[PDB]
Amino acid sequence: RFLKVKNWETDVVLTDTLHLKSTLETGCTEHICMGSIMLPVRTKDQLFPLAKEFLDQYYSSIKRFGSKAHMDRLEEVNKEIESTSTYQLKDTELIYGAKHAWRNASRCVGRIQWSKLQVFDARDCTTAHGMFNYICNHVKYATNKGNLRSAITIFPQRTDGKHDFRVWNSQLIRYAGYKQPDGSTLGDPANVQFTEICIQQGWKAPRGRFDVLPLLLQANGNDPELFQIPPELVLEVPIRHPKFDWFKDLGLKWYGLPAVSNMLLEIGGLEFSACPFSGWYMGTEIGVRDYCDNSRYNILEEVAKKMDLDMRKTSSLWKDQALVEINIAVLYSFQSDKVTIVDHHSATESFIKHMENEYRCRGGCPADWVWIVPPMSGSITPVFHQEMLNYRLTPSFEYQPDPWNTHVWKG
Amino acid sequence: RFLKVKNWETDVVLTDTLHLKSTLETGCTEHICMGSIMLPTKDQLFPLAKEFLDQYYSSIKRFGSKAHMDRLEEVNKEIESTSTYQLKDTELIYGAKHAWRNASRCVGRIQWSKLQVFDARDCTTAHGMFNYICNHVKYATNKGNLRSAITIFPQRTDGKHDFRVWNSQLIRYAGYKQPDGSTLGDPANVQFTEICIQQGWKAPRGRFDVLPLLLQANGNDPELFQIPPELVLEVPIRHPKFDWFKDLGLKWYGLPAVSNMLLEIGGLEFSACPFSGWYMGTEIGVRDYCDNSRYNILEEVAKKMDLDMRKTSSLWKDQALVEINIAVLYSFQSDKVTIVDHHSATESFIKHMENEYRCRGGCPADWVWIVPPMSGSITPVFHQEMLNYRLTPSFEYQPDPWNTHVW
Ligand code: HEM
Numbered sequence: 001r002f003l004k005v006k007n008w009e010t011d012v013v014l015t016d017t018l019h020l021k022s023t024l025e026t027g028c029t030e031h032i033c034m035g036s037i038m039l040p041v042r043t044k045d046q047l048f049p050l051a052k053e054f055l056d057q058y059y060s061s062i063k064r065f066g067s068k069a070h071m072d073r074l075e076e077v078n079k080e081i082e083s084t085s086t087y088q089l090k091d092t093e094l095i096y097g098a099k100h101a102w103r104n105a106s107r108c109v110g111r112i113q114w115s116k117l118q119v120f121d122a123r124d125c126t127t128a129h130g131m132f133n134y135i136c137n138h139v140k141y142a143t144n145k146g147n148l149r150s151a152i153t154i155f156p157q158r159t160d161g162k163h164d165f166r167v168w169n170s171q172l173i174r175y176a177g178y179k180q181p182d183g184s185t186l187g188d189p190a191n192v193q194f195t196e197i198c199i200q201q202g203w204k205a206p207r208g209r210f211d212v213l214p215l216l217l218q219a220n221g222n223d224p225e226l227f228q229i230p231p232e233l234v235l236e237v238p239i240r241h242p243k244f245d246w247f248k249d250l251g252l253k254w255y256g257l258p259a260v261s262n263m264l265l266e267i268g269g270l271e272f273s274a275c276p277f278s279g280w281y282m283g284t285e286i287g288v289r290d291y292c293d294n295s296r297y298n299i300l301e302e303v304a305k306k307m308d309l310d311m312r313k314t315s316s317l318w319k320d321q322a323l324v325e326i327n328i329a330v331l332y333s334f335q336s337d338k339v340t341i342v343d344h345h346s347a348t349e350s351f352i353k354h355m356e357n358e359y360r361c362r363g364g365c366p367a368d369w370v371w372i373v374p375p376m377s378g379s380i381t382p383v384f385h386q387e388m389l390n391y392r393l394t395p396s397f398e399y400q401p402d403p404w405n406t407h408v409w410k411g
Numbered sequence: 412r413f414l415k416v417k418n419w420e421t422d423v424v425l426t427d428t429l430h431l432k433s434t435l436e437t438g439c440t441e442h443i444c445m446g447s448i449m450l451p452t453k454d455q456l457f458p459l460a461k462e463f464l465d466q467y468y469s470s471i472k473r474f475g476s477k478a479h480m481d482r483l484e485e486v487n488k489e490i491e492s493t494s495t496y497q498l499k500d501t502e503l504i505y506g507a508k509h510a511w512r513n514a515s516r517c518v519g520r521i522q523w524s525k526l527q528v529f530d531a532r533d534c535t536t537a538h539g540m541f542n543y544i545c546n547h548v549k550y551a552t553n554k555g556n557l558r559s560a561i562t563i564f565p566q567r568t569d570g571k572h573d574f575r576v577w578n579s580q581l582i583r584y585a586g587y588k589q590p591d592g593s594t595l596g597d598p599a600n601v602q603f604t605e606i607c608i609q610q611g612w613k614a615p616r617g618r619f620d621v622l623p624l625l626l627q628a629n630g631n632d633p634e635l636f637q638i639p640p641e642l643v644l645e646v647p648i649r650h651p652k653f654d655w656f657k658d659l660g661l662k663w664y665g666l667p668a669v670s671n672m673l674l675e676i677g678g679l680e681f682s683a684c685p686f687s688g689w690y691m692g693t694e695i696g697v698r699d700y701c702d703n704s705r706y707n708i709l710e711e712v713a714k715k716m717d718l719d720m721r722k723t724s725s726l727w728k729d730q731a732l733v734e735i736n737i738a739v740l741y742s743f744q745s746d747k748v749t750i751v752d753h754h755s756a757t758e759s760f761i762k763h764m765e766n767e768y769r770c771r772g773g774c775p776a777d778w779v780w781i782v783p784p785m786s787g788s789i790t791p792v793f794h795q796e797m798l799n800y801r802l803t804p805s806f807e808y809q810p811d812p813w814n815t816h817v818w
Pocket residue numbers: 098102105107108109110111113117150151152260277278279280281282285342347371397
């Protein structure tokens with residue numbers, strides 16, 4: 001079968017064959033679309049086909065399909081699975097796998113970059129202190145004094161599901177949130193629950209608006225342990241506006257390195273439950289969502305107040321007006337400090353180019369429109385006008401339950 | 412089988428059961444989501460009739476009554492004998508209101524039960540169609556205090572006798588390809604404009620020429636009519652702070668009236684059923700004015716604002732976008748033509764979703780269409796999970812008539 005997608009701005013029509021290689025399920029059926037739903041211990045028997053499918057992909061990618069090296073590797077993996085119930089990836093296969101999980105991530109707009117990914121192999125790690133050291137190095141390498149480089153660090157894979165490595169933080173670097181007795185929140189409301197966990201674990205909270213959380217790290221299924229990332233390694237950007245001199249006085253800053261640490265990397269049926277990865281920000285993630293969501297820093301009022309917009313009626317578009325100024329400020333600030341960031345115009349345009357290249361060379365590009373379209377100025381970016389097809393390819397990054405819900409406390 | 416939707420801003424969770432009554436197909440499968448794709452006999456007719464009459468009779472709390480069973484009997488007899496059947500006025504009004512209610516891409520559905528239905532099933536000619544349409548336009552416009560309405564022409568018979576309005580909306584501006592290479596007016600309407608000219612229209616070849624109606628009665632060849640100018644309410648666009656905005660020469664019309672869709676009620680097909688509500692500001696100011704393949708005005712406006720257009724990261728497009736949308740809303744309000752902004756509209760739709768969940772067990776909604784094309788995440792719908800599914804009665808797309816019509 002062939003599936004066609006049209007761009008309604010350009011009339012460019014693309015043809016998708018890649019979706020035929022898709023195995024995992026979407027949530028959708030012929031009777032219901034769940035395209036806007038946020039979230040819609042293996043046997044030997046299920047493992048070998050997964051390994052085989054993966055290794056066939058790997059061996060094809062290197063133009064060695066059906067070679068002796070290919071066949072020997074299948075036999076070697078087969079025998080390893082039968083004898084030990086699992087298997088180990090060669091370094092080459094790990095790097096390929098991690099790049100492909102990124103390539104396949106349908107909610108990521110930054111995928112033009114997929115082939116430039118520094119992979120840190122942390123499969124020799126044994127302890128939470130070892131994890132902390134690996135993560136410091138990843139943060140320092142990725143930060144590169146503002147000239148950000150994409151990286152992932154891959155800790156040992158799941159075995160029986162009782163010895164999992166986990167990073168409990170949702171991102172390596174995030175700000176604390178503190179619920180007050182009067183019901184207000186100080187700092188980031190998204191991180192209140194994780195913050196309370198850190199405090200309970202013994203973190204001494206400074207209790208300010210932008211406190212970098214400690215790492216909470218679990219090795220080999222043991223109880224997690226707390227660590228402070230050295231502050232000298234946490235690059236931050238104070239936010240100011242090119243024309244509005246009062247903007248600095250809102251006291252805003254953000255961190256330069258977005259590093260997702262709570263997802264699971266699946267490669268050839270193996271599960272890497274601790275695999276923090278980082279790239280660089282698109283300006284809207286900070287200036288739209290982190291600053292202006294009602295459930296986040298929620299600064300729209302204070303900003304529109306200082307701009308003296310008419311706030312008595314929504315139809316003056318004061319919220320829209322303040323939103324644009326905040327986003328200009330974020331981009332201006334990062335650029336002024338030489339910290340990598342991309343605007344939503346540049347990012348979405350590159351993604352369209354990436355997407356077309358992918359159709360031509362690969363037979364498709366799975367893409368989740370709901371996530372790809374930026375949360376401001378949707379239709380003046382080219383992605384709004386682009387039909388997309390969403391389906392799940394492996395290797396992949398997956399959600400996993402938060403570890404405080406599943407962890408068996410050893411005490 | 413029972414499905415949950417969460418709002419990620421408020422943590423409110425709703426349970427959808429209505430989807431189990433879903434009849435038509437989405438385009439998606441377990442392997443592939445097509446959520447962002449724009450367009451994804453006697454034997455057939457009786458189940459469809461029954462299903463509809465059952466829901467109608469349930470809705471007036473008379474399910475399984477002798478009057479329910481009698482009507483099912485009557486319609487059955489009529490199908491078996493005439494191969495089709497005729498809706499009672501009550502069923503027609505109910506079907507039309509529910510087609511709107513079921514419209515998953517419509518953010519304005521809080522209004523669904525306040526719809527004026529104009530029964531034009533007695534219409535026989537294109538002149539009759541024109542009369543019906545002018546009356547709809549005048550009624551709905553109501554000197555700027557807009558009222559929702561639908562006008563329903565005779566249903567499909569053997570399909571060689573279709574009523575159709577050839578226009579995509581009752582009121583739209585012409586588009587002209589120029590020797591220059593550029594496009595004058597609205598590029599969305601270039602082809603339909605050519606069809607009008609080919610059928611006889613004298614185009615004034617301007618930027619904002621209201622198109623004529625091209626009306627097809629009884630499967631006949633369609634005919635042209637100019638809507639009396641005095642019934643087409645238009646709004647000049649000015650900005651409350653930028654005195655220069657008016658020099659751009661922009662206007663839009665007050666009445667959004669989709670005329671190219673098909674209303675399906677109880678298996679009956681109404682191929683000509685123009686309907687109208689009122690505008691959400693972004694439809695005009697974001698899409699009609701700023702789409703690259705539409706009036707595409709961002710460059711011009713930005714120049715007037717003296718913005719640095721050297722680099723995308725100055726957000727000059729975004730700044731000008733807001734201003735254009737401020738001007739649209741201000742101009743409609745100053746002239747007292749009903750308009751809703753995207754904040755107020757999406758807020759209402761969230762309240763409507765809650766009502767529908769509470770009173771009906773759900774609300775089919777297409778997030779891709781419901782979230783406004785500017786400022787998405789500062790409107791509450793962005794944060795609201797939605798389940799999309801197809802209920803009947805429905806509004807459906809249908810092939811453009813010129814691709815099908817035999818002269
Ligand atoms: C290099 C520059 C990159 C840019 C500009 C970028 C951009 C983005 C953005 C804007 C999102 C949505 C974020 C949100 O709304 O929370 C996203 C999601 C995602 N990205 Fe990227 N990204 C980059 C690098 C990477 C890398 C290096 C990886 C992995 C190797 C990756 C994998 C993903 C995944 C798995 C998601 C979905 C996350 C989720 O569902 O929460 N991205 N990306």
